[PDB]
Paper text:
Protein myristoylation generally aids in membrane localization as well as protein-protein interactions and stability by increasing the protein’s hydrophobicity. Although multiple Plasmodium [name] inhibitors have been identified, achieving high selectivity against human NMTs remains a major challenge because of the high degree of sequence homology between human and Plasmodium peptide binding sites, where all known inhibitors bind.
As a result, N4 makes weaker electrostatic interactions with the C-terminal carboxylate group (separation distance of 4.0 Å) but is positioned more closely to Thr197, forming a hydrogen bond with the side chain hydroxyl group. This difference, together with the misalignment of the piperazine with Leu410, is associated with an orientational change in the inhibitor and displacement of Tyr211. The high selectivity is likely attributed to the distinct way the core and head groups interface with the adjacent waters and polar sites near the carboxy terminus, which accompanies conformational changes that propagate throughout the peptide and myrCoA binding sites.
Residue numbers in the entry: 26 to 410
The structure:
């Protein structure tokens, strides 16, 4: 609770507030020549391991570590269960670096007991585009918790990123760290109502029977945008144009290349869904969501919470409410239990009328080595995985 590590880093202190025009690094004029060239030292018995996520053996070790040891909610009901495919997809975006996928092994057993990763991305923050590392999947094995391994993982990936002449990073966390640039509550639209109530994800309102809740939280009968279809390769430049134009209104967003659109949006069953309303090669509307199940801890009636997470949604032919109603239906049609979304972009406006419930927490957006004013989450135009 006292931030002994984080207050040594170029991030804001917890009570810092910055003026409305500053937009620049905390530590500027960095020189690659000054970056530590060797890996940070580890205690005897532990070693760094650069992972090849395209290799089945390495990927399996990452998958096993995260499945057993990655993020849990604050009541330890759920643990994220990113698929091995999702991990491959998330980590091998265009121009990724294998040397930014770094683990720590326990030498005696040759097992992976720590991990952190980054991928490169261009991030526009308050109208300035900066090449950044997007950091994700920080994880320490449960048996090695509270041994200060996380600061070493963070410092080591920072070194590896700095060696590429990159000095800023973006990341999200459900925990409060110094210091969010924005903080977005999450909301959910129940689809498989009885399951969500039985596992403790949702509460049954005291005025409702289970049977009535199932009826009341039914989804729309048919699409508002009836021509929706899965995205195809030929749609990449059209999605690039539609999404790229939409995102320029926000204070924080990724500046996607055509290659990045193809990577992040072309569909992969049970990983990433993108639907488009296309006419004469123009993409008029798009819906996208990704698949991230949570293992339901200690519950033998169900295995996973099969959740869809809102990604990027843009409409020109409907209202935003109609678009997001269609997103919920498309998730339901693909057998998802729940549709989760953040109060970013225009999402907040739809939550009441589309019968979303408010979640039990918020997702914090962070920048490393960047000084600027924080802002309300409606100004956030990026969804991290
Ligand atoms: C220019 C390039 C820069 C690149 C780097 C950019 C920064 C990237 C930052 C990483 C972005 C990650 C994005 C994601 O992946 S967020 C998801 C994080 N992972 C999990 O929640 C999985 C389950 N939990 C664990 O695996 C461990 O509990 C973790 C690994 C979280 C801590 O391990 P452990 O419990 O064994 O603790 P320790 O003794 O080793 O270390 C204690 C220190 O760790 C600080 N801590 C705790 N939780 C987090 C957290 N979620 N982000 C950052 N720091 C965190 C804490 O403040 C303390 O420092 P201080 O309080 O003394 O200051
Ligand atoms: C159903 C469920 N399962 N688990 C394991 C949880 C925590 C939930 C609650 C629902 O949480 C969200 C709902 C919507 C969006 N984001 C989250 C969210 C919340 C906390 C942390 C993360 N991480 C770490 C940072 N990087 C992205 C992923 C994500
Ligand atoms: Cl493979
Ligand atoms: Cl977290
Ligand atoms: Cl009932
Ligand atoms: Cl391009």
């Amino acid at each position: 609770p006292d931030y002994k590590f984080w207050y040594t880093q170029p991030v804001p202190k917890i009570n810092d507030e910055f003026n409305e025009s500053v937009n620049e690094p905390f530590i500027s004029d960095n020189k690659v020549e000054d970056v530590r060239k060797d890996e940070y030292k580890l205690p005897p018995g532990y070693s760094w391991y650069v992972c090849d996520v395209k290799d089945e053996k390495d990927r399996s070790e990452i998958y096993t570590l995260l499945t057993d040891n990655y993020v849990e909610d604050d009541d330890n009901i759920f643990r994220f269960n990113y698929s091995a495919e999702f991990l491959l997809w998330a980590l091998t975006s265009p121009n990724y670096l294998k040397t930014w996928h770094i683990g720590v092994k326990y030498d005696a057993s040759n097992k992976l007991i720590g991990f952190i990763s980054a991928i490169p991305t261009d991030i526009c923050i308050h109208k300035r585009t900066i090449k950044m590392a997007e950091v994700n999947f920080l994880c320490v094995h449960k048996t090695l918790r509270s041994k200060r391994l996380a600061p070493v993982l963070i410092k080591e990936i920072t070194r590896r990123i700095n060696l590429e002449n990159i000095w800023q990073a973006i990341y999200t966390a459900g925990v409060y760290l110094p210091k969010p640039v924005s903080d977005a509550r999450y909301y959910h639209r129940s689809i498989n109502v009885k399951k969500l109530i039985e596992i403790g994800f949702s509460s049954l309102n005291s005025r409702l029977t289970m049977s009535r809740a199932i009826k009341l939280y039914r989804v729309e009968d048919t699409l508002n945008i009836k021509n929706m279809r899965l995205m195809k390769k030929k749609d990449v430049e059209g999605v690039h144009k539609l999404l790229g134009s939409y995102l320029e209104q926000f204070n924080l967003y990724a500046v996607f290349t055509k290659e990045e659109i193809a990577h992040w949006f072309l569909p992969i069953e049970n990983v990433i869904y993108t639907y488009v309303n296309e006419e004469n090669g123009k993409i008029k509307d798009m819906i996208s969501f990704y698949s991230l199940p949570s293992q339901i801890l200690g519950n033998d009636k169900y295995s996973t919470l099969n959740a869809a997470y809102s990604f990027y949604n843009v409409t020109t032919t409907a209202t935003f409410k109609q678009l997001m109603q269609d997103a919920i239906l498309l998730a339901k049609r693909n057998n998802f239990d729940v549709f989760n979304a953040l109060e970013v972009m225009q999402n907040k406006s739809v939550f009441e009328d589309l019968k979303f419930g408010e979640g039990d927490g918020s997702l914090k957006y962070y920048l490393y080595n960047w000084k600027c004013a924080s802002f309300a989450p409606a100004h956030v135009g990026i969804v991290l995985l």
